[PDB]
Amino acid sequence: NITIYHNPACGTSRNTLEMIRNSGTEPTIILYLENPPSRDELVKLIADMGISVRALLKKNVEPYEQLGLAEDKFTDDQLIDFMLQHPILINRPIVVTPLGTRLCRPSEVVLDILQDAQKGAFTKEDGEKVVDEAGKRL
Ligand SMILES: [Cs+]
Ligand SMILES: [Cs+]
Ligand SMILES: [Cs+]
């Protein structure tokens, strides 16, 4: 039972999705830019990922820039409500599996929460080797 909050235009998200598939399961794919999580769902995701609200904020996107979010003048709940109102602010990809939830940045973080081992070697789309055929992390 795996869910990925995916942005197909993001290489990290594409690599994470292919590693999930290479473990032998096809995840539910949520295109969060169009179908964001609810507030309670987002609050839960953040608690499970063990990171701060601000660590989830995507920088270098229009609402981050124009709402001045680089400045330390926002409570965690203000930041959560901006994420809900402007889903491009939610960094990506988030992956949920029975073992837990992670912000999979870099993408190989996903290996922590995949229950089954990669089924053969995995190389990222830019040629960076991740696991060899034997299954060792490079
Ligand atoms: Cs939702
Ligand atoms: Cs694991
Ligand atoms: Cs890259």
UniProtKB/Swiss-Prot annotation:
Site features described as Important for activity. Involved in arsenate binding and transition-state stabilization, chain residue numbers: K58, R92, R105
Organism: Escherichia coli
Active site annotation, chain numbering: C10
Catalytic reaction equation(s): [glutaredoxin]-dithiol + arsenate + glutathione + H(+) = glutathionyl-S-S-[glutaredoxin] + arsenite + H2O
Family the UniProt entry places it in: Belongs to the ArsC family.
UniProt function note: Involved in resistance to arsenate. Catalyzes the reduction of arsenate [As(V)] to arsenite [As(III)]. The resulting arsenite is then extruded from the cell via the ArsAB transport system.
Effect caused by changing C10S: Loss of reductase activity. Mutant is sensitive to arsenate
One of the Pfam families matching this protein, by short name: ArsC
Protein name: Arsenate reductase
Subunit structure: Monomer in solution.
EC number: 1.20.4.1
GO molecular function terms noted in the UniProt entry: arsenate reductase (glutaredoxin) activity
Modes of activity regulation: Inhibited by the thiol reagents iodoacetate (IAA) and N-ethylmaleimide (NEM). Activity is rapidly inactivated by the histidine-modifying reagent diethylpyrocarbonate (DEPC).
Keyword annotations of the record: Arsenical resistance, Oxidoreductase, Plasmid
pH-dependence annotation: Optimum pH is 6.3-6.8.
GO terms, biological process: response to arsenic-containing substance
Top enzyme class: oxidoreductase
Site location (Important for activity. Lowers pKa of the active site Cys): H6
